[PDB]
Amino acid sequence: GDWSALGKLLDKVQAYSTAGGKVWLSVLFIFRILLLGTAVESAWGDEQSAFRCNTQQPGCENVCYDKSFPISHVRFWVLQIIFVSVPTLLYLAHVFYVMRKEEKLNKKEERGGLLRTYIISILFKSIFEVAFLLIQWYIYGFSLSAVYTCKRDPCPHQVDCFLSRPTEKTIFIIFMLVVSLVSLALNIIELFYVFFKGVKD
Amino acid sequence: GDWSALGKLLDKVQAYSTAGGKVWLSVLFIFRILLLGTAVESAWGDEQSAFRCNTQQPGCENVCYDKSFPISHVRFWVLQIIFVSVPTLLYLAHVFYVMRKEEKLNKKEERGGLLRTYIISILFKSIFEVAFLLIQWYIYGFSLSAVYTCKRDPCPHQVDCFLSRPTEKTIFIIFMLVVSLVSLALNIIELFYVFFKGVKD
Amino acid sequence: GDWSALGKLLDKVQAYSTAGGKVWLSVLFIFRILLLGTAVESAWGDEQSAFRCNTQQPGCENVCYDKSFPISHVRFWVLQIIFVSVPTLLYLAHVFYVMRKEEKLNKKEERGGLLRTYIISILFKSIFEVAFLLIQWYIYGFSLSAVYTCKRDPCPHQVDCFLSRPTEKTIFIIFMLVVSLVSLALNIIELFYVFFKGVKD
Amino acid sequence: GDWSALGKLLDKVQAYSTAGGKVWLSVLFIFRILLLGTAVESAWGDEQSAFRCNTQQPGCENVCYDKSFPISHVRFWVLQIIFVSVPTLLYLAHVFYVMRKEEKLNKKEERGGLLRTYIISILFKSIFEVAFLLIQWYIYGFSLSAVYTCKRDPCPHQVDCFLSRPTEKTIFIIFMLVVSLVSLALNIIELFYVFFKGVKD
Amino acid sequence: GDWSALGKLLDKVQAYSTAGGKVWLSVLFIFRILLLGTAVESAWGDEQSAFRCNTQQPGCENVCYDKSFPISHVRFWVLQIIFVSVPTLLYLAHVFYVMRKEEKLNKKEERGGLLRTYIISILFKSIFEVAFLLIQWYIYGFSLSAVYTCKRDPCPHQVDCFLSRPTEKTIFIIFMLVVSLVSLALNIIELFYVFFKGVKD
Amino acid sequence: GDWSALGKLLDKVQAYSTAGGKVWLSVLFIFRILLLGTAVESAWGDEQSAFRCNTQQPGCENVCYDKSFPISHVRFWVLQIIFVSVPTLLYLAHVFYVMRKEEKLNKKEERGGLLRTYIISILFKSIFEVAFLLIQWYIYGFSLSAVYTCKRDPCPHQVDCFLSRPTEKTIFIIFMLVVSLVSLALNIIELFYVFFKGVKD
Ligand SMILES: CC(C)CCC[C@@H](C)[C@H]1CC[C@H]2[C@@H]3CC=C4C[C@@H](OC(=O)CCC(=O)O)CC[C@]4(C)[C@H]3CC[C@]12C
Ligand SMILES: CC(C)CCC[C@@H](C)[C@H]1CC[C@H]2[C@@H]3CC=C4C[C@@H](OC(=O)CCC(=O)O)CC[C@]4(C)[C@H]3CC[C@]12C
Ligand SMILES: CC(C)CCC[C@@H](C)[C@H]1CC[C@H]2[C@@H]3CC=C4C[C@@H](OC(=O)CCC(=O)O)CC[C@]4(C)[C@H]3CC[C@]12C
Ligand SMILES: CC(C)CCC[C@@H](C)[C@H]1CC[C@H]2[C@@H]3CC=C4C[C@@H](OC(=O)CCC(=O)O)CC[C@]4(C)[C@H]3CC[C@]12C
Ligand SMILES: CC(C)CCC[C@@H](C)[C@H]1CC[C@H]2[C@@H]3CC=C4C[C@@H](OC(=O)CCC(=O)O)CC[C@]4(C)[C@H]3CC[C@]12C
Ligand SMILES: CC(C)CCC[C@@H](C)[C@H]1CC[C@H]2[C@@H]3CC=C4C[C@@H](OC(=O)CCC(=O)O)CC[C@]4(C)[C@H]3CC[C@]12C
């Protein structure tokens, strides 16, 4: 029977949030982490072993693979999720510490103080997710072709290379895209609601 | 001695369900997850290493494997199970939050409100499972042959490829099919019972 | 100090069982699962990598391996153990739920009802284990030879193939066989005892 | 504060044992399991990949490896340790159940009964460990040579094969041998003490 | 309900630290360990398997790889993080032991004593992190080129070698660099604050 | 709230030890185990796969590798740490059992007894660590060269072999050496202190 303080912190951290938004956002986060950890990781098990190019020059395949894939999508998604998860942890730690400070102050002596930080965290999450989506659109796009052309030294003129299981990777990319879009929509809806309620004072 | 609240939530979430259906559905879910995680995963350990085609052109085997298997069945099953498991988690979280809200309201002051969401969750589970079954029937069918014909560029005209342990994969596919059929039958029986009882008011 | 209810359920679920049979069956189950998970799994680490056939035709080894081994014994044993473990879990869940229902009924108001299901579970376990043993006898037998003859297309006429470490696999097969025989004997002894006691009323 | 019953069972199960023998036997068991699980397992990581024979006939190396090593020592040690650990678990379960039965009997009503089983367990442990040691002496001996001669079909006349890191395996075999000898000595000392005390009545 | 002593130790160990610095430093440490353990480790999965040099002499690639990479960056980062984490653990253990000693002393009898050690720990952390950064700058720099020249025996004159995915490794190196810079800035800010407050007495 | 007995045992087992030595020794042990388990294990991931010798005779590389490395350093370090950790566990178990015996004796009835064993454990730890260090100095030394000469049958006259990443292994060997030296110094300081205090009576 030592769950009262945890419940108190949980209910105090959810003051200004919508009744429905909490469950949707939590289950979306859980779905994202489960999908990232369970099966999509094995799809990128063989990123370079099965990658072959049609040439005889040794060492050309390494540089061609480097140029084709500047960074694997799995680690990009990991960075995205950790960067969208950090601000909530910061907010939780800050509110926990200030609550303990207030508890000590009231034990010894037996708007905007919190909403501003909440809005800052929400806008940071939104801007980070939209920036990551824009970067992914700019670098890789949202389609993969099984044939790639490589024109980097020391490979002569042009060479051809083939990827592995492009359809599966494309499907998973689309899934991550739609999940991120849903997350952005939920965050912007929450921000609109809180701002609309704050206008009415 | 901190299990009273968990038991209260567990008994409150099982209000309108049948006496017998709960145990059957729970053990079916446990059997499905155990079978998916324990042994069937190792059967797909070598999906592309042992896959060989009878040709000398480099790079043809990659595209032939891509065309033969647009998506591995294991990850399809993982997506199916997570999509049929999410709505129950949503329902549980929603009922937990509303119960906490009612507890706070009654502490400070010392049909269809829930059945509609229950029916929505049941119908969502049924439609998702039947849609996944229909998609699996449409794409892969329910039989695998050890010999496949590939007619994709840059392979000349037609080439032949061989899979690995098709009989074992076919057996596991049939097992998953019958498990899904049992799940659908249980869900439709529960829906029929609850609707029949609701007709009598 | 929250183990009283678990102990109550444990002692209530063991009403009609013999004093000695409980420990023997439990330790047999633990021994079986430990042996299956600890060391025998590594013996089947290389099932197809070390399997070689004496031919030059590409792709013949895959179909020959498929025909030689329709299904690996490890996954067959996993299916057998899960199918002999499910009915006990069903019985436990059912008795737990009915006990909670009776507790609620008696709180608000401050033979064959269970033996039939017990006998059904025992007979189901016995019939499933004997069926699995019969299937294993019919398909694989209980001996493995290091040399196998393959006569399947597209391999010409007949080819020869060699397995790996047949003696170790044979020893483990014999071990699993004797364990299953002991389990069947214990189950039939329990059934005989309970029926003999029920005859005397 | 729910450790009183566990302590009661622990002190009741250690009635007739020596004051010093308990700690020595327990730490010996812990040392054995830690050594088996931590580092010696990796030494047998490459049992067949690095095993090479000096021939050109395909498939001869498989049968030669099978004949050279009928069973890996690691799994033999696992079987030995599980077979010497089971009887103590049986004794603990039996004494726990009879203690619960006596507790229920005394709640409702508010030598050789145990020593015989104890001696049976001790003698079973001793006979099993000595039998395993004798079998290991009879089959593998206690020395490994880096060169082995194979005279099994279909290899012509005689062929030569080489093992991997024989010195390390020999050292670990000697370590397991001395640990087993210490265990046997401790068990026989305990049996001698208990019999000598029982003679005096 | 056994968390009071842990909370007491946690609040006593955070006496002289800033209100804001605690959460920032803790979340920075958590982010660092999560990034090190989650995804960056897999990027160095193939450090030597994919490393190829353009030559025919056997054994030259080993020495060229040894000369190119005196030590992998992952283990260097592990050493850095463990060396910057040890002093805080030492401080925590020391304060815990002295608090227990004082508790015993006061039970039986029913500035600079701690700040000096705190400052020592802070300066040790700062000097260790700056030393590690300087060493990394001196040895590897902060850029990797896909082509390397090797001039070590027994390779004739000069040979060329190619690395793998240099861009990803460079990105992760930059990430670790900026994280370390942030950590150093936070530590120096904390030291400046505590010294400035100690000047005023 | 069930930590009082554990704290009592912890404070009673630390009677004669120095105030400062406890934390230093504990953190040294934690650092050693963390370093052994975290990163140094992966450095020996490829001990035999990358080891190549300049010859054409099959099977010579196996015996040359066996002669070059009689035993891997990682398992030697594991044996060293387990052998220096066992005596403390023995002392803890013995003091726990005698404390329980005294508690039972005083409940029913409502120098050198411990220091000798403490000194025995300390001297055993010191002698074991110094013996392991001497053995490591005698067998492997403290330096590794990338080129090794092999003169064992059936290799003709002399052959040359190359190791992998010798610099990293040398650095880790030096690290383990200095850690062991620090441990020996701490143990001898503790022994000197306790003997000096015991002289004064
Ligand atoms: C070992 C794990 C399984 C449990 C211990 C860690 C948890 C207490 C932490 C880790 C990650 C946290 C989550 C990280 C991100 C978010 C998104 C966050 O989104 C919001 O709705 C914004 C803040 C709010 O409205 O509460 C809600 C909290 C949540 C689910 C956090 C809840 C608390 C979690 C589960
Ligand atoms: C770490 C794990 C082992 C325990 C912590 C998580 C559990 C509390 C959750 C995770 C998955 C949940 C299950 C996911 C899906 C379902 C199907 C669901 O199906 C129904 O019968 C519909 C709803 C109902 O009638 O209760 C019943 C609840 C159950 C078993 C859930 C029960 C609660 C579970 C076990
Ligand atoms: C995470 C694990 C280690 C603990 C949580 C799960 C256990 C509470 C369950 C899982 C598997 C169950 C076992 C599965 C099969 C059987 C065989 C069954 O056989 C019988 O004797 C028939 C029924 C009876 O007489 O009780 C006895 C119960 C037992 C050991 C079950 C006891 C309860 C177990 C250990
Ligand atoms: C998950 C694990 C770490 C804890 C849960 C299981 C333990 C409660 C069991 C598992 C294995 C058991 C051990 C298996 C074998 C033995 C040898 C046995 O040898 C004897 O001295 C004979 C019997 C006696 O004199 O008590 C003593 C008990 C012991 C250590 C057992 C003690 C209880 C153990 C640790
Ligand atoms: C099994 C794990 C997940 C929990 C058990 C171990 C923790 C109790 C320890 C392990 C590592 C420790 C951390 C290691 C390093 C630091 C940095 C340290 O930096 C400071 O702010 C300096 C000291 C202070 O101001 O408190 C703060 C404590 C913290 C987070 C420690 C807090 C306590 C931790 C989490
Ligand atoms: C699952 C693990 C993380 C916790 C359960 C096991 C611990 C209770 C044991 C396992 C290893 C033990 C350690 C092994 C070796 C030593 C060295 C030993 O060195 C001394 O200072 C000598 C004895 C003393 O002065 O106390 C101190 C105790 C300690 C840290 C032991 C403390 C208790 C430990 C952590």
Numbering used by the authors:
A (entry chain B), B (entry chain C), C (entry chain D), D (entry chain E), E (entry chain A), F (entry chain F): 2 to 111, 148 to 238
Provide the authors' own sentences about this structure as they appear in the paper.
Gap junction intercellular channels (GJIChs) facilitate direct communication between adjacent cells and play important roles in various biological processes such as cardiac contraction, electrical coupling, cell differentiation, and death. GJIChs are formed when two opposing hemichannels (also called connexons) from adjacent cells are docked, each being composed of six connexin (Cx) protomers. Cx43, also known as GJA1, is the most ubiquitously expressed connexin protein. We identify three different N-terminal helix conformations of Cx43—gate-covering (GCN), pore-lining (PLN), and flexible intermediate (FIN)—that are randomly distributed in purified GJICh particles.
Since CHS appeared to contribute substantially to the GCN conformation of Cx43 GJICh, we assessed whether the structure would change in phospholipids without CHS (condition 8). We identified four conformationally different hemichannel sub-structure classes, which were more than expected, because only three conformations were identified in the protomer-focused classification. Two of these structures, termed GCN and GCNTM1i, showed similar GCN conformations but substantial differences in the TM helices. One of the two GCN hemichannel sub-structures (condition 8), which accounted for 7.3%, was nearly identical to the structure of the full GCN GJICh in POPE/CHS (conditions 6 and 7). The superposition of the GCN protomers from these three structures showed an average Cα deviation of 0.6 Å. The map density of a POPE molecule between two neighboring NTHs was clearly observed in the GCN and GCNTM1i hemichannel sub-structures. However, that of CHS1 was unclear in the GCNTM1i structure, and CHS2 was barely detectable in either structure. Therefore, we concluded that the GCN conformation can be formed in phospholipids without CHS.
